[PDB]
């Protein structure tokens, strides 16, 4: 059924699974035309396909060329997402194919079920969790790779860096969701907290700074404060 706070530990068991977030696939800038009408200009997007156990992020870059001469782009974006996820599964050896794919938005269920008819044993699941994967494009290196792409590409990142050498998947996923929740709520504040101390760098192939365990504790605390700081404003609570 649906993934929720009740069945949360399932994400970290030994059944291969992927989360699929499609919220950055179809991206536009809205602008005025010379005649004072409004038009959109598509910019490059991405599919966020994450193994929450290993941290493997299959970032499929969606180049604006996909959209050329197509209608109903917000509908097509769901089907292109399902097409690319099904292509990714087909590309993997049997023993690496997921047993479940969890979609962050219910509108992805039918497109993905239909594209995955050839895989009746792969469970396509929604979730009641409000995951902050939409903020993926606030991670500088992910944003950079997407915006620079001149053709369809698909880059594999480890969104946990080398955290799994020191912490469990459960803990790494909690850290990732706190960072993304922070970036989503107030990107400027979040980025300031992460990049304030120039002595702490980001490794060439990492996404996040090389915090010591004790420095992660301070960072995680500052991220919580930010999410509360901003929450007492949204709701005047």
């Amino acid at each position: 059924g649906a993934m929720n706070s009740s069945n949360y530990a399932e994400l970290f068991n030994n059944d291969i699974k992927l989360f699929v977030d499609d919220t950055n696939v179809y991206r536009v800038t809205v602008h005025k035309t010379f005649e004072g009408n409004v038009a959109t200009k598509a910019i490059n997007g991405c599919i966020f396909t994450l193994n929450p156990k290993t941290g493997h992020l299959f970032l499929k870059i969606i180049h604006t060329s996909v959209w050329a001469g197509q209608k109903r782009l917000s509908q097509l974006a769901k089907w292109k997402t399902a097409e690319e996820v099904s292509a990714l599964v087909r590309s993997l050896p049997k023993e690496e194919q997921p047993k479940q794919i969890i979609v962050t938005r219910k509108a992805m269920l039918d497109p993905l079920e239909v594209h995955m008819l050839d895989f009746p044993n792969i469970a396509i699941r929604p979730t009641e969790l409000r995951l902050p994967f939409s903020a993926a494009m606030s991670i500088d290196k992910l944003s950079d790779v997407v915006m620079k792409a001149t053709e369809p590409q698909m880059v594999l990142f480890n969104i946990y860096d080398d955290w799994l050498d020191r912490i469990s998947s459960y803990t790494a996923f909690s850290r990732l969701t706190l960072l993304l929740r922070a970036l989503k709520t107030n990107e400027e504040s979040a980025k300031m907290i992460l990049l304030s101390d120039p002595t702490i760098t980001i490794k060439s192939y990492h996404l996040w700074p090389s915090f010591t365990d004790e420095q992660w504790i301070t960072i995680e605390s500052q991220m919580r404060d930010l999410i509360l700081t901003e929450y007492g404003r949204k709701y005047n609570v």
Binding site: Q75, L76, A82, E83, P111, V114, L117, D118
Partner: protein, 300 residues
């Protein structure tokens, strides 16, 4: 001109003949139904007074043999039987008619309702959906499951309706996933019409039979089938103009005939709202849209 005699009526029962029904009392001197119109299939149906969890009946065509009803006190139901001896049968019917122990099939001359509900329904097709090849008539009841329902459990007692599944390899061509899912024309026209049914008449026949089994027996699987065959047409951008026009007439008479108080359980809100207001054919079913809006505006 076409009589179904009854041996007797030992148990109190509501008897239906097509869209008509009457009450028979325990041991009432009732010896059957006369003046049944030749040229159509018919259904004789039963609901015992003592147990309404017992709703069942027989599809038959009087052109295919001499049929009678006789209560079986062992199996506890009214059973259809064929009399092979023409003269014993003629002698039984003549006697019961002389003693006026039969009800008359009470057709209004102006009234084409039964023709309109059974136009494409053929006994030969009924006998493929309901398999019991040793009889010329077909038993259906409220509890009988469809082959499709049996997939998701006695095959001999099943309704063999054509399996329709929108999220199936049958319905979706590789490389046309979004196209075939959003516009079901391929599935309707190539897979179902050209491939399985051969023609729109056989498709309409199964649609009409499913509706009638839903209405007369509250057969749930039949209701699912009727809605699936509507939805497949309404979800197809490319349908022959003759098929849309005929579908509008078919559905009009089915909505007209449906008891007012059963709309809640026999009509699927989602399918009808999609078919009349969102689908490719939202502007193609004028008669159906008008009777639905005037008879069941709550559902919509």
């Amino acid at each position: 001109m076409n009589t179904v005699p009854f041996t007797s009526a030992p148990i109190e029962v509501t008897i239906g003949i097509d869209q008509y029904s009457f009450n028979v009392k325990e041991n009432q001197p009732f010896h059957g139904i006369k003046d049944i119109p030749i040229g159509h299939v018919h259904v004789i149906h039963f609901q015992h007074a003592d147990n309404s969890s017992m709703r069942y009946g027989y599809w038959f065509d009087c052109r295919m043999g001499n049929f009678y009803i006789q209560y079986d006190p062992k199996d506890g139901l009214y059973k259809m039987m064929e009399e092979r001896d023409g003269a014993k049968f003629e002698n039984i019917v003549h006697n019961f008619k002389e003693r006026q122990m039969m009800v008359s099939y009470p057709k209004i001359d102006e009234d084409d309702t039964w023709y309109n509900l059974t136009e494409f329904v053929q006994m030969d097709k009924i006998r493929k959906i309901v398999r019991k090849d040793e009889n010329q008539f077909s038993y259906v009841d409220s509890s009988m499951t469809t082959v499709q329902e049996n997939e998701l459990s006695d095959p001999a007692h099943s309704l063999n309706y054509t399996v329709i599944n929108f999220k199936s390899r049958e319905a979706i061509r590789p490389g046309h996933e979004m196209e075939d899912f959003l516009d079901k024309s391929y599935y309707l026209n190539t897979v179902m019409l050209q491939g399985i049914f051969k023609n729109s008449s056989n498709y309409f026949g199964e649609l009409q039979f499913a509706f009638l089994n839903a209405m007369f027996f509250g057969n749930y699987g039949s209701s699912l089938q009727w809605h699936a065959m509507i939805e497949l047409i309404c979800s197809s951008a490319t349908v022959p103009k003759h098929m849309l026009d005929k579908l509008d007439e078919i559905l009009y008479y089915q909505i007209k005939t449906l008891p007012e108080q059963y709309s809640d359980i026999l009509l699927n809100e989602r399918v009808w709202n999609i078919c009349l207001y969102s689908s490719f054919q939202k502007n193609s079913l004028h008669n159906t849209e008008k009777i639905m809006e005037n008879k069941y505006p709550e559902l919509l």
